[PDB]
């Protein structure tokens, strides 16, 4: 399961569902991930609304904000819920980027998400049943 295309497909979905357009077996993981995400965003929508209004994205601080939030998110543990939030947070930042016309920032966020998946979350995912475990937990 390629972590990059997991990111790419997810970000593209979340954006196109908000009205933006973006130049981007195994398909089950992608479908399950974005379904869990839409459910996550819906339930805590007011919260995500308050979070997006405090992001305060600038081209200078962007990568710092991503690094900081993500680090504190997994600072004291990793579970599938937090991994979903990690994708959803990435989505929030990508949406707030095109909201201010910083399209190139989306590609960078996509890069950062991918880099974080390979470097940190990957070992956890493998040692916790792989993505198949996630599908069994967030599917039917």
């Amino acid at each position: 399961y390629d972590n990059r295309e997991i990111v790419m497909k997810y970000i593209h979905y979340k954006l196109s569902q908000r009205g933006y357009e973006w130049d981007a077996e195994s398909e089950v993981v992608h479908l399950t991930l974005r379904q869990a995400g839409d459910d996550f965003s819906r339930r805590y929508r007011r919260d995500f609304a308050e979070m997006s209004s405090q992001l305060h994205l600038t081209p200078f601080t962007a990568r710092g904000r991503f690094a900081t939030v993500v680090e504190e998110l997994f600072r004291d543990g990793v579970n599938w819920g937090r991994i979903v939030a990690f994708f959803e947070f990435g989505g929030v930042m990508c949406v707030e980027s095109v909201n201010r016309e910083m399209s190139p920032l989306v590609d960078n966020i996509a890069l950062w998400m991918t880099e974080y998946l390979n470097r940190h979350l990957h070992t956890w995912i493998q040692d916790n049943g792989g993505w198949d475990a996630f599908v069994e937990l967030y599917g039917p």
Binding site: Y44, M51, V69, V70, N79, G81, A85
Partner: peptide, 19 residues
């Protein structure tokens, strides 16, 4: 008001519903 704190909190509520 803190972003990662709230995100982490609701993430765990979401996860506890799946056990």
């Amino acid at each position: 008001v803190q972003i990662a704190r709230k995100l982490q909190c609701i993430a765990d509520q979401f996860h506890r519903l799946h056990v």
